[PDB]
Amino acid sequence: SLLPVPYTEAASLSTGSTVTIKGRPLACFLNEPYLQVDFHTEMKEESDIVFHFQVCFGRRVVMNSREYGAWKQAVESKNMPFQDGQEFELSISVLPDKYQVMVNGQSSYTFDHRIKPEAVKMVQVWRDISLTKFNVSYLKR
Amino acid sequence: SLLPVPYTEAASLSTGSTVTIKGRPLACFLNEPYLQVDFHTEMKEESDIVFHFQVCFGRRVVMNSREYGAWKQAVESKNMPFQDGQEFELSISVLPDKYQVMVNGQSSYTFDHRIKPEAVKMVQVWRDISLTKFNVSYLKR
């Protein structure tokens, strides 16, 4: 809807940063829409991915990194706090040792840093969602 | 781009009908964009699917049907005529015994009818593409 999807924003991340995303899946869960959030090391979409977060709504979540062109060890989760047909609020916080992903205010996934978050230059949000809000916080030293 | 995605059109199919789709993937193949074409038995997206065609660009194609709410036996193919970064023309012809899928003029997949094509009432084209052309032919008795 309001924001264009695929959505790309230049970004910088460090401990204490938060990425906030508000959106809605474009299809009922029976049709298995996806959502993907990628933290890139360059503005180019083929660049490395420090944190890859892919939701198959109603089924599974996969997290990984792409380093020097190659996907590393996938982390797969069956935790599914997203609700069929509902708007969601997704929050990704940079902690000292990991990303923490909150879904509608509830801690739902974490992912230990494989690359320093300082390597991030770009965030992309895409696949089968509409987006009404995207924010990266920049309040900390 | 020009046509809205997800794209839905009421449709009727019988022997000799052709569905023509011209589009472009929204991402390079390294990021694994998808394309999905579904022939539905009702205008509602939760309705049964007589022919489901899902491309994971650069990797695989899965075809199936959803009958009374349940996915049946998947047909998986590694044939990949789609070209990274390129516009594609996709043609799906209804033959007496099967669907035949042409990609840029080349026969690439077929799928034997599990449900009569006359059961189709709607076609949906969605996932990670832009669409510039969609047509269903209606020339035959």
UniProtKB/Swiss-Prot annotation, chains A, B:
Residue numbers carrying N-acetylserine: 1
Domain Galectin residue range list: 5-137
InterPro entries reported in the protein's UniProt record: ConA-like_dom_sf, Galectin-like, Galectin_CRD
One GO CC annotation: cytosol
Chief location bin: cytoplasm
Alphabetical keyword list: Acetylation, Cytoplasm, Lectin
Subunit structure: Interacts with CEL.
Protein name as annotated: Galectin-10
Function: Regulates immune responses through the recognition of cell-surface glycans. Essential for the anergy and suppressive function of CD25-positive regulatory T-cells (Treg).
Note: Forms hexagonal bipyramidal crystals, known as Charcot-Leyden crystals, in tissues and secretions from sites of eosinophil-associated inflammation and some myeloid leukemias.
GO biological process: regulation of activated T cell proliferation; regulation of T cell anergy; regulation of T cell cytokine production; T cell apoptotic process
GO molecular function: carbohydrate binding; identical protein binding
Domain of life of the source: Eukaryota
Site keyed Not glycosylated: positions: 135
PANTHER family per UniProt: GALACTOSIDE-BINDING SOLUBLE LECTIN 13-RELATED, GALECTIN
Subcellular location, record wording: Cytoplasm, Cytosol; Cytoplasmic granule
Annotated gene: CLC
Distribution of this protein across tissues and organs: Expressed abundantly in the bone marrow. Expressed exclusively by eosinophils and basophils. Not detected in monocytes and neutrophils. Expressed in CD25-positive regulatory T-cells (Treg) (at protein level). Found in intestinal tissue from patients with Celiac disease, expression is directly related to the histological grade of mucosal damage and to the number of eosinophils found in the duodenal lesion (at protein level). Found in sputum of patients with eosinophilic inflammatory diseases such as asthma (at protein level).
